């Protein structure tokens, strides 16, 4: 009867009929061109005077290893 319980049952019902977006989901997929849906991005800042300011600690940093060249493990193991 609670609000969260109804939403959880809706999501469990939507767990079935999932995968590559068949049926009604083909039309419902076009809601992203109709109501400005925000995608799964991480926000890097905030507007103060309408000019966006990217906070430098929220800029993306990738900890790549020192050398991936002549490293002795490949993505494939011999049979």
């Amino acid at each position: 009867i609670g609000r969260e319980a109804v939403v959880d049952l809706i999501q469990q019902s939507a767990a079935k009929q999932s995968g590559i977006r068949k049926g009604w989901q083909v039309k419902a997929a076009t809601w992203v061109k109709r109501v400005h849906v925000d995608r799964g991005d991480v926000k890097v800042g905030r507007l103060e005077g309408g000019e966006f300011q990217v906070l430098p600690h929220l800029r993306p940093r990738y900890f790549v290893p020192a050398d991936l060249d002549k490293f002795q493990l490949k993505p494939y193991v011999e049979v």
Binding site: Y62, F63, V64, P65, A66, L73, Y76, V77, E78
Partner: protein, 205 residues
């Protein structure tokens, strides 16, 4: 046969096949009974198992080169007989015979001749069902050998709480402060460290 397929109760509850592939068999029924052949492949379906033999149940196959009309080529091909329609030929009298699953010594199960003395010289040998070995054709680039892949590199002896393993490098100490051997110089080049440096140099000059 019956055209439903799913109404059939699934047979072969214990998976044991008296006929194997590559063996001489006798066709018991159909358009060509009394003939013999060698089994090319057995389709092990629990509901409708078939056996394809060497050049016996020959029917013309209309191979359809993709087209709307009558453009196709025709090739004779061995149609699949039912598994029950065939029986193994014994090598002595040329007549069909029943194969039994006799147990010999060492706990192994073999295929005997259905005799009251089932022993050596009555065993029908069964060939192996697999030969796809990629072990030949290995050692290509982008591959690693099994002995290299099984190194015990991981140890829990290290990795203990080390908040001060920084070594003080601009952001190569940030990762081992958040818990790391060497960051690439290109990765630190991506987060530019020269926007303030140019303003500092211009102010100095």
């Amino acid at each position: 046969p019956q055209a439903l397929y799913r109404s059939i109760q699934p047979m072969f509850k214990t998976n044991r096949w008296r006929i194997c592939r590559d063996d001489l068999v006798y066709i018991l029924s159909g358009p060509d009974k009394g003939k013999t052949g060698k089994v090319l492949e057995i389709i092990k379906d629990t509901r409708t198992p078939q056996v394809i033999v060497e050049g016996r149940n020959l029917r013309k196959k209309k191979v359809k080169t993709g087209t709307g009309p009558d453009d196709f080529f025709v090739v004779t091909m061995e149609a699949p007989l039912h598994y029950s329609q065939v029986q193994l030929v014994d090598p002595q009298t040329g007549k069909p015979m029943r194969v039994i699953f006799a147990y010999t010594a060492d706990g192994t199960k073999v295929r005997s001749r259905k005799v009251p003395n089932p022993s050596t010289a009555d065993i029908i040998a069964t060939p192996s069902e697999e030969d796809p070995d990629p072990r030949v054709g290995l050692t290509g680039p982008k591959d690693t050998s099994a002995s290299l892949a099984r190194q015990a590199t991981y140890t829990p002896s290290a990795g203990f709480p080390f908040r001060v393993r920084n070594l003080e490098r601009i952001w190569a100490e940030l990762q081992p402060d958040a818990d790391x051997x060497x960051x690439x110089x290109x990765x630190x080049x991506x987060x530019x460290x020269x926007x303030x440096x140019x303003x500092x140099x211009x102010x100095x000059x």
